[PDB]
Paper text:
The SMC protein MukB dimerizes at its ‘‘hinge’’ domain, which connects via the long coiled-coil ‘‘arm’’ to the ABC-type ATPase ‘‘head’’ domain.
Recombinant MukE, MukEF, and MukBEF were efficiently pulled down by gp5.9FLAG-bound beads, whereas binding of MukB and MukF was lower or nearly undetectable, respectively. This suggests that gp5.9 binds MukBEF mainly through the MukE subunit. In size exclusion chromatography (SEC), E. coli MukEF and gp5.9 formed a stable complex, whereas little if any binding was observed with P. thracensis MukEF. Contacts of gp5.9 with MukE differed from those with RecBCD, as did the precise path of DNA in the respective DNA-binding sites. Moreover, within the resolution limits of the structures, gp5.9 positioned several negatively charged residues (D11, D15, D21, E24, E36, D38, E43, and E45) near positively charged residues in MukE (R140, K150, R163, R164, and R179) or MukF (R322). Most of these ion pair interactions mimic DNA phosphate backbone contacts and thus prevent the natural DNA substrate from binding efficiently. In summary, these results suggest that gp5.9 inhibits DNA loading and support the notion that DNA capture is necessary for DNA entrapment.
Residue numbers in the entry:
A (entry chain E): 9 to 213
B (entry chain C): 5 to 327
C (entry chain I): 4 to 49
D (entry chain D): 6 to 292
E (entry chain F): 7 to 209
F (entry chain J): 3 to 49
């Protein structure tokens, strides 16, 4: 009928919050002590259950959890635009910045924006922002607002915890390591990208 | 939220200002060194001009305009109230120049390398304890107004507050030491990833132990100092003509309480930092022990646009509802 | 009748509330200027 | 022997101070606010409010308040006038304090201190007691640790600070002299006849204070030098205590400077009084 | 606590459940047509009413036999509200289902009839506001109105009120689930009169 | 660690508030995209 531990866990009053949160994409980091402990105790049976939905449960080596739908899933999937991926990669770097340690892990969006413009080909972001823009102040401000919108979209997924009563700061969680799957392996990024596609991690765009 | 800028208005009125670029600060430091090296404690204008000669040559300025440049710099220095001039009657235009308290403080912060040490704290502490015990005995004995003024009010005003300020300064030096260690840590990890771990581990614990010892001593002293202040306040409570001593006692109590709370808060902050550091090592220094991951990520972002891509995340359809 | 929440969760909720409010306020002006641009283009075309 | 080493080092480290009127006003407001709160710690949210006050006082733009405040905080931290302690639980997630140089600056502008003889009397009494104890302990003699603790430590960590404070008090009296000169100029240039009496009063009071200071300092210095000579004679019996001998020599030199400064200042003051009275006789009374 | 009632587990174990759960949480008005789903719900209604209560959601069976999920102000599952024009289309679909000609047509209608019904029984000015706030009242506006009416009909088909027939989208059949838009007119008067009154009042 | 105690009648408010903001923001996103398409069509018409 049902495994004993699966039945016992399902009755746990903490379950509904997770069940609704995970199927909306939320990644679970180490911070949420109670939720993470619950998942640790009952990983096997939860994985078995969701596998009936035709969706997969993944625990990457870093220690987080996330839901990955397969081709024939019974719950839809979705992706995110290029700008969000860019912001995610930048966030991934800041986590690793050895000079950052003075900041204890708290950051500010001003640094995020300033750093970003040191890498991306200025126009190649402007075109995604506005074709007519060629470094004007107004379009720079427009991009400044677009990055905030992307960051809110990212937080909803669980990559960053906001802090304090002022939005101009935030904290990064270890779930950002996902954005590095491209460079995880030492082989040519292209074949690795196709391998990721085959595994279902990412779809080409 | 209402405002109180009166002090700012007054300062803007008096035109207080400091302007010490690198060259002027080097000149002032040369003055301080030369003064420290002489046995007479006095400088003729010639010595100042020679020091400015050396400072100017160090920066490679025009050598034909040393005199007027130096004179105009020195006049403004006097204007900014760092130097005080004395017209030695035997040589006009060759006055004797001496530093003011502000200048001495500025120069000392740089030249006098003050390294924190606990023996200083213990000794200062014992001295203040003895002074305060004497003051308390004098207050309890009692006497006329002259007795009070000479034996209670003056000691507290002119000795105790000085020692407490010195202890505060010592804690500020401890702050600077912590900042140095932080910087050190940062750079040390940035040099090499796998090796530095040990060093880091040692540093952290050493600083924590020093903090603990300091805080313990401070509290153990504060108990008795507060008891003595209470004794003095109780002794004064009976006389209605000694409010000035009451205000001073209140100020001393508040200052000591701030001093004590400070150390506990700092220890908590250091524990947080420690934890942070540890976290960092576990999640990042085992994964890319050879630093390849970060460089590859840099390059991938740099050349990202050559082949965009996007990853996937489950997004269940939201529940539809009516009004 | 009383709910207890960890300090971190409440802080996160408040920060997110403020961020969302600021984003919405900005986007209002963004739409306003876009519509004004459309209106100006239409007026100048005629 | 040439200086350039120190200037080269300072140039290498990029030491510098830059506090124009507005930034200095902000720093003074910071110190004044800090002086009042019982917590002993101030958050970024209060720093921005302090900057708002100064900004309103200077008729500056109110639309760039946050950015200008953050830039000012960065400038301050760069010059080493503040320390930044991250504290997520605090409003703004930051705690700010004053570093030793910041206190040394702000105290002199705000914490006004004027000279008083009783202060010096107390310092002389305490230092005399400490040096007597040190000389006795050294005369007792013992192991190297005995010196390191009971002899070296008092001399290095107690006596020197009191001597430096005595020097600072002398500098304060010098500042008072300068203020007196400016005050006499201001008074006399206003209403000559009506200001001469104040002129004479100021001169007399200044001279009396100077003479009393010098006499007190001589009286104390005799005994202090006696005890320093005692400790020196004691340590010449041991060849392994050069560390203490050099400190003794430096302390003697400091005392010599302190004592000669008083006499030089007194001579300068008597000359100044002579010139002032000649000026009065030749220009004031004549017209 | 009481970890699990036997019948609750037996119900959650039925192999068909997961699709039903995912559809329900999408709000679909599971009805009689799905004889299997209807039977399964009939067997284990009360216990599924009990379980979903933890989500702060009421599993309500309407009088006419169909089932749908109605959450409260404190839902633990995200909820979204559909646009007004969708509600207008829903009401119009409610009216047609009552037409006596349904039996003659077996319930087969084509999008042209629905579009004409909307246009004739709806205010032109309100619709022109709906289609585009800058609309000039020209034809292009009416063509885009037809396009969005088609899109809304597709969304409603996702809700499950209507069925597409064969492999051509031009033919569709209505089911009894449409009453969710007509339950407001449960009065005993003429459905035409009640719907006309509601549409006139803007309700 | 530290905790915050709140009554339900107050807690429910912020949960409603954030959801309303999110829905309004998404609707505005859609409307802005539609306006963008219109302006693009007008621009290509002009040129």
């Amino acid at each position: 009928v049902m495994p004993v531990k699966l039945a016992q866990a399902l009755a746990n009053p903490l379950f509904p919050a997770l069940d609704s949160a995970l199927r909306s994409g939320r990644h679970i980091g180490l911070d949420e002590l109670d939720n993470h402990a619950f998942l640790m105790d009952f990983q096997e049976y939860l994985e078995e259950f969701y596998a009936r939905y035709n969706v997969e449960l993944i625990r990457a080596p870093e220690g987080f959890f996330y839901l990955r739908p397969r081709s024939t899933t019974l719950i839809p999937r979705s992706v995110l635009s290029e700008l969000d991926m860019m912001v995610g990669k930048i966030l991934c770097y800041l986590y690793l910045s050895p000079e950052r340690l003075a900041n204890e892990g708290i950051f500010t969006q001003q640094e995020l924006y300033d750093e970003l413009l040191t890498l991306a080909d200025e126009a190649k972001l402007l075109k995604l922002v506005n074709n007519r823009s060629t470094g004007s102040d107004v379009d720079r401000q427009k991009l400044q607002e677009k990055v905030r919108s992307s960051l809110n979209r990212l937080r909803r997924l669980g990559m960053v915890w906001f802090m304090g009563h002022d939005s101009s700061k935030f904290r990064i969680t270890e779930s950002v390591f996902r954005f590095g799957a491209d460079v995880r392996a030492g082989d040519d990024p292209r074949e690795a990208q196709r391998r990721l596609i085959r595994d279902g991690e990412a779809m080409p765009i | 939220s209402q405002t109180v800028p009166e002090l700012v208005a007054w300062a803007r009125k008096n035109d207080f200002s400091i302007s010490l670029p690198v060259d002027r600060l080097s000149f002032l430091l040369a003055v301080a060194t030369l003064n420290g090296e002489r046995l007479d404690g006095e400088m003729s204008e010639g010595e100042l001009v020679d020091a400015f000669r050396h400072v100017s040559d160090a920066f490679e300025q025009t050598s034909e305009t040393i005199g007027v440049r130096a004179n105009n710099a020195i006049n403004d220095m006097v204007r900014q109230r760092l130097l005080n001039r004395f017209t030695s009657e035997q040589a006009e235009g060759n006055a004797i120049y001496r530093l003011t308290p502000l200048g001495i403080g500025i120069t000392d912060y740089y030249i006098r390398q003050r390294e924190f040490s606990t023996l200083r704290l213990s000794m200062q502490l014992s001295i203040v304890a003895g002074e305060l015990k004497r003051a308390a005995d004098a207050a309890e004995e009692g006497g006329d107004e002259f007795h009070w003024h000479r034996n209670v009010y003056a000691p507290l005003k002119y000795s105790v507050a000085e020692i407490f300020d010195s202890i505060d300064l010592t804690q500020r030096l401890m702050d600077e030491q912590q900042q140095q260690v932080k910087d050190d840590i940062a750079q040390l990890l940035n040099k090499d990833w796998r090796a530095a771990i040990s060093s880091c581990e040692l540093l952290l614990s050493e600083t924590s132990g020093t903090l603990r010892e300091l805080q313990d001593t401070l509290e153990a002293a504060g108990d008795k100092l507060q008891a003595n202040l209470l004794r003095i306040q109780d002794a004064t409570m009976t006389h209605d003509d000694l409010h000035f001593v009451d205000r001073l006692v209140f100020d001393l109590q508040s200052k000591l309480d701030r001093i004590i709370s400070w150390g506990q808060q700092s220890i908590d902050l250091w524990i947080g930092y420690d934890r942070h550091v540890h976290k960092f090592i576990r999640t990042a220094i085992d994964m890319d022990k050879n630093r390849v991951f970060a460089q590859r990520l840099r390059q991938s972002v740099q050349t990202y646009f050559d082949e965009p891509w996007a990853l996937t995340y489950a997004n269940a359809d939201r529940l539809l509802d009516m009004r | 009748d009383l709910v207890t929440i960890p300090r971190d969760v409440w802080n996160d909720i408040q920060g997110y509330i403020d961020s969302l409010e600021r984003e919405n306020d900005s986007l209002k002006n963004q739409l306003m200027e876009a519509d004004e641009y459309v209106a100006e283009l239409e007026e100048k075309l005629n």
